Amino acid sequence: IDPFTKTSLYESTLKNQTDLLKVTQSTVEDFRSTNQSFTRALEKDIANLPYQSLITEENIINNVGPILKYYRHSINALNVYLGLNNGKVLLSQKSDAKMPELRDDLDIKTKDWYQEALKTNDIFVTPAYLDTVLKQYVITYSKAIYKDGKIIGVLGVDIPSEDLQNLVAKTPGNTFLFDQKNKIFAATNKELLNPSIDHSPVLNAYKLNGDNNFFSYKLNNEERLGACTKVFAYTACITESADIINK
């Protein structure tokens, strides 16, 4: 292959694969920002209630509860809730259409979504974890809600992590996402989810090359091409065979 031609093929495929990597990055970004906007809107609607509606538990149930429910329905969230400093949490949960209940048994001050919300003025986004209420893996968005400077409680919104997984999987390209512990999280090719697959070659090549920088690596003595980039605490990657440049 004339070097001119090989370079043309390499430049083309780098552009192609870069573009697809960016689509997967965008998917992750847009998922987060939609959920943040939602959480912010809910914060605002709660905080705009008069204090009278907020300062007794029965009023929280009757005035906040409907808001949690409507918001939960509007986005098909798994759980939407407001945790109070007395350790109770007003919980709107998926599934029997019973009204939101004020639960005293959920150990909320032990939870990262609660604690961490009180240490930042931003929305806090958890890693994926197993929700204690409905026993599904969720990503939680939490926010300490204040009215005229006084804490009301900590809002939480649980979105199934499978929702993000499914969005990533639908994207074009052989793209995939690792979580903060560098464990595979999502992939267009579901086979990459096998927990016994070794991802060191890709992850090592990423470590050397940095975000969005295309690299070459080997699999079973054949050349492949790829790139990764950080997206929040996740690492998004794309790989392909190098046959496009070599053959």
Ligand X SMILES: CC(C)C[C@H](N)C(=O)O
The binding site for ligand X (CB under 6 A) comprises: 79, 81, 89, 91, 106, 108, 111, 131-133, 138, 140, 158
Closest approach of ligand X to the CB of residue 24, in Å: 26
Burial code (b: 16+ CB inside 10 Å, e: under 16) for 126-144 equals bebeebebeeeebbbbbbb
Closest to ligand X by CB, 89 or 144: 89
Q: Toward ligand X, which CB reaches closer, 25 or 79?
A: 79
What are the two backbone dihedrals, phi and then psi, of residue 60, each rounded to the nearest 5 degrees?
-55, -50
Smallest distance from the beta carbon of 85 to ligand X, in angstroms?
15
Decide whether 28 or 108 has the Cβ nearer to ligand X.
Answer: 108
Residue 170 CA from chain centroid, whole number: 16
- Nearest residue (CB) to ligand X, 136 versus 212: 136
User: For the stretch 184-223, what's the b/e string if a residue is b when 16 or more beta carbons lie within 10 angstroms of its beta carbon?
Assistant: bbbbbeeebeeeeeebeebeebbeebeeeebbebeeeeee
**Which residue, 160 or 173, has its beta carbon nearer to ligand X?**
160
Looking at the Cβ atoms of 49 and 106, the one nearer to ligand X is 106
Give the other-Cβ count within 10 Å of 26's Cβ.
Answer: 13
- Yes or no: say if 215 and 21 are a contact pair by the CB < 8 Å rule: no
Q: How far is the CB of 126 from ligand X (least distance, A)?
A: 9
Q: How far is the CB of 186 from ligand X (least distance, A)?
A: 20
- The first and second tokens of residue 172, run together, are 């074009």
- Whole-number minimum distance, CB 78 to ligand X, in Å? 8
Distance CA 188, CA 177 (A): 9
Whose CA is closest to 184, among 203, 167, 171, 170?
203
How near is the Cβ of 203 to ligand X at its closest, in Å? Answer: 30
User: Residue 204 half-sphere exposure, CB side, CA atoms within 13 Å?
Assistant: 7
